[model samples]
Target chain A: MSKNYHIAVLPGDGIGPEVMTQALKVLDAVRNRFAMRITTSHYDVGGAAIDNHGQPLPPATVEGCEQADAVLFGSVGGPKWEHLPPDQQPERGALLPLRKHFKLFSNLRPAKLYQGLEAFCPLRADIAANGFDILCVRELTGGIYFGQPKGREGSGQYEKAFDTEVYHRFEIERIARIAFESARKRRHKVTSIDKANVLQSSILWREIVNEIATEYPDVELAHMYIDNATMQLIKDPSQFDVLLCSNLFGDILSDECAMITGSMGMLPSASLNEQGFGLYEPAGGSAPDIAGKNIANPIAQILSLALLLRYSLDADDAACAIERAINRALEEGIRTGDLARGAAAVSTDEMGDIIARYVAEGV
Target chain B: MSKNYHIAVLPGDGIGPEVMTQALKVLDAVRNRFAMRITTSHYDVGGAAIDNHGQPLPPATVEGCEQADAVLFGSVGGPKWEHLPPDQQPERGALLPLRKHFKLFSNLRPAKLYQGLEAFCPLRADIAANGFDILCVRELTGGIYFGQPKGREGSGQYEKAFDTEVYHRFEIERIARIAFESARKRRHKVTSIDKANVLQSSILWREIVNEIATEYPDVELAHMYIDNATMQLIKDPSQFDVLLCSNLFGDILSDECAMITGSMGMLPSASLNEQGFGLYEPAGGSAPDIAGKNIANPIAQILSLALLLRYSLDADDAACAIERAINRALEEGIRTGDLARGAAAVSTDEMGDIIARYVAEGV
Candidate 1:
């Protein structure tokens, strides 16, 4: 009997197909090494779906995803879809609906600076030489961004607009639980970022996170204000292991973390819901300019596969092997167009081939 | 005949008095070199005021500051004052009341990296060597921090909470005008940060900023999402000239700016109203740990005086002279205990003396 894992490969518009093709190949290598049966179903979406099916996301694609164990999403949207109305945009039509369908509530973005890339790191050489591995557990579902009773009124110079920032204990509790669990696997430290001094939502968030901390006494918990958090992120990036924050603050800190990594092409992100279902993708967006060129970096996508393996499938050994292999490839100075220095650049497929080979060799 | 200016000096507590003494000494040198009549009135505030007058902010201190052209404030609070209630806390009793009384809306924090101090910068060697001069014009008041209808309800697990983020056209317009006019004096670019994609307040903020840009054709205006802004700040500090943000975002960005400079000992800050009536102070707080020890650095205080000259007194020449003089002293490798690196450390007064002499000699 063979164990089966159903994976949804949604190769979105632009360079999505190009990089994602290499990612699927890496996945094939991982399956062969682990002696597991893997099945992937491709879906048409984004600008391509808009052209083929007259809608950004077709019903058949949605059905395919709903049937998969985890999603491997490549980048979405392109110039061809830019002329479409905002509602019909690929990102809005395809991605948002999928998130809603799955109730994806937590976004996990790992910003880890690879070794030997100290020259590329933005922080001081000393700061970067030690390297930084930070996982940002962002609450993606609720906040002022989607809060009700929010609207704009008044006119002319008297114009006034308002957005309500609200959160419930359940929402706070779930995110807090995720962060604590994440810390258990990392360095046993979690820094909760909030503005409790001013906002009631943040006050409740702090209280709930503190309560959750009691459940995991083995892990150390620290609280910080959002302002201080951003300052600290740049002043000392390595001080953090797991950063837990609300939707508003997380939206800011995650980007700051991504930038400090010095190479967005190497970062992978995952958004998960209550049921352990997740959408894993690259931190960097769809590169429409370089679409179909076969030169786009695919490491982020391969890393996304590793995240999908760990988070949704509970295949920690396989996931760790994949992550280690990717790092091994980078340490050997295998260059992609985005990360090429004086070193010669390799095509997307070539770099993927190298990393997959390393993974197949069992770390 | 000589031009006369009035300055109110409130040396609050701890190293507050230590640093203020040096700042006043440097002010004296500036007055002598420029052939200007300068009058200084000393007042008591913070814990010192509480000790002498049974209050953190004395009535006499308020009167003294109200009668001056600009107020020069040192740090406040200490361990002895930590037991005080929230309303009577040194920061609350003195700083909050003062800001409320003056209606100070725009805060200016200039984070400039001095040459020869690149080793101290937290950014990459090349980035630090290139140096960066960024001024954050943060709105001092308003935003979600003080927004209405904000509070928590219920109890325990069922609890809920909310905070409103509201902004008016006048509030946005006034802050926008200040940023543009201030930009004209520097690199002539303003990067206004907001979350227009989600927040209604930000949509209105972006529109008003665009309207304000038409009035400042000589200065370039750009809008950035708060998330991207925080990332860009660390990735390339040199790209920004003047950053304009709300109280919440400013509280974050200003600190990030301070950290990148790597020496809080050398930063200055200001909060001004429409009348150009402003309060100038060091960016760092009162180091009570070293209180009365005369070991605290006074460069931040001296730089505060420079900001006071340029912003409140219409003394741009005097301001430029003070700034250049401080840089000249640092280039000579004059180190304080906070930044000593195999170099002789100067006392609070000794560091003050060298910079004062340099300023008196007209830079």
Candidate 2:
């Protein structure tokens, strides 16, 4: 009998708790059918934690997730906790602490259009022409954001602000290994982006990646400057495979890739550490405007469960099953308001129910 | 009588020297008729500077710009200089130092179509129905770049890099003033961009710019997140008035905006300090592949001179005189290889002679 995996589910705030209800439904269906033992330990965190406890992240919330085998993070961040200090910010408390505690240093974002969701994409008519599937591997830590001496300068009338882009070889190598391994699992191609032309650290980065290439001989590697790549992304996004970039470029590229899909609510991300544990969450923030209305797209939250299954529990087949179900729902003309574009729309619960049924029926 | 500007011209390398010669001929004709003198102090930079001073930015070249009221910079950068150290790189020594030394904070890129040059634009008849013109104000020297601790990591294996984004009150205020002032001169609308949701600095930025709005109450102001602005630039570029943003967004946005103007060579930029001293240049790097072949576009270089005259020298009449000559040349079927688009094109010298004669008669 497969051991029942315990998941620390922190459906943080706003629509997070709402979407988690759908995801947990799908999980219930998956576990019952597959005979996989799964249990979730829910806890208080983010805005709700602020509402209940004086603090946004109670020590008990951290303790629950730490003791669990894996954690499923619903989206975090909203106006309710906006007044908190930067350090004690609710979203940061739930997110950064999870990353810090779990040592989730590598973030992965797969930029792929699900089969039959072509109508939602901005690239009209060419949907069949350009098969868009890109996976980004971004280093989640040890960049210029934390580099010492980072500051702003302004006198009474003149002001200037600056940030440094710093990189070390080991930092590049580990992320490079993750990217290379990911490429080996998929297309066998990797494009490492940096400003080697102007940045010294990037020059060293290129050299280190070049050296690492010797080990991953089966995986093909290429180089591109960030500025030109930014242009190319708009021009021919179809030409890329697995993209690896430094911290800032990673943030910019990952965020930009999310926009290309046009549905921020449907994006899911996972920050992984070397020990193989990951912090999975939907990429979009808590849409406080639509929080109680129950119309927020439950797709991203559902997909986060898919990622949790694949990366943490090594259940790739189950993850694919969930993804296929979402694709079927899209093909059957079911979409949320953001993806609707004034077309016929499904209520969030209806869409979730439809996906859950599709998962149960295996169609 | 208005003074004839002494143009310190460095048609450095690649397409540099090719386009400059034609620009000079037109300048001469304008000078002859407008009763102004353009005493051009041409000095070698880029590849030539590397040969003469063992560096891409010779100290003497910097001194020459200091001596001249306005320096006309030709394109500089190619695979030829790609092998050099970052310090010796033309972009670093020639480009970076010049912007820093001049304190040229606000970079202006005007996207305007000439009489017969509209064919080069990508706009279809329906899209071009309203016509298109946009002036992008890119706040240079004020962003995540140029911050301290720009270095590589230790351990020779960890892959990590970061860049800081810092903005001061004064920088935002000055940039906001530039946008408003420019808008007051043209269309009375300004759209400022920032990442207020993610970055606190941008929050401070929006607050500061909003506070500065009292000075130019007539100019309409709008705020946009940079991500949304990127999408809007592609959707309806003409809708933008004076789109403004910090250094990084400015760089990316300007490049995206240039694509709408057709070829990159058609773009011209001007960077100015608070003292009103400005430096004008073509917004393209030297195309080493087409360098020395007289195949480069001289229109951007020539248009840059028109900007120099119109804005800095306060010679709006003279600026008009030079601008119409280029328009008339295009109207009269004058063709440079770069602009000819595979059609039978005139050599650089022949085209220059044609334009010079036209300018002489037009002025």
lDDT of each: 0.86, 0.75
Model 1 bad stretches (over 4 Å): A339-345, B155-158, B339-343
DockQ of each: 0.79, 0.29
Report, to 2 decimal places, the DockQ of model 1: 0.79
Candidate of highest lDDT: 1
Query: Which pairs of residues collide in model 1?
Result: none
Determine which window of 10 residues in candidate 2 chain A has minimal summed lDDT.
A120-129
Tell me the tens digit of each residue's lDDT in model 1 across A59-126: 99989989999999988885577585776889988888998988899999999888757678888888
Query: Candidate 2 residues B1-363, lDDT tens each?
Result: 558456678877788887888888888887887787668898888777877777777778889888777888888877766574776577776777888888889999987655466555443333434556788998877666664444544453454454456677777888888888778766888888876664556777787888878788998889998767776664466788888778877777777677655556677889987766778889877778777667677888888888787767767677767767777887676767544555768887777787788778844
- lDDT at position B289, candidate 2: 78
What is candidate 2's CA lDDT for residue A111? 78
lDDT by residue for model 2 (A1-363), tens: 156588989887778888899899899878866777888999888877877886768889888877876788875665467675765777766678778887777999987766665544443234323647788889978665454444456656555444455666667778888888778757899999987765667788788899889999899999998767766665566788899987767877876666556455688888888766777888877777878676888888899888888777877778888888987887676776645556747877877788888888755
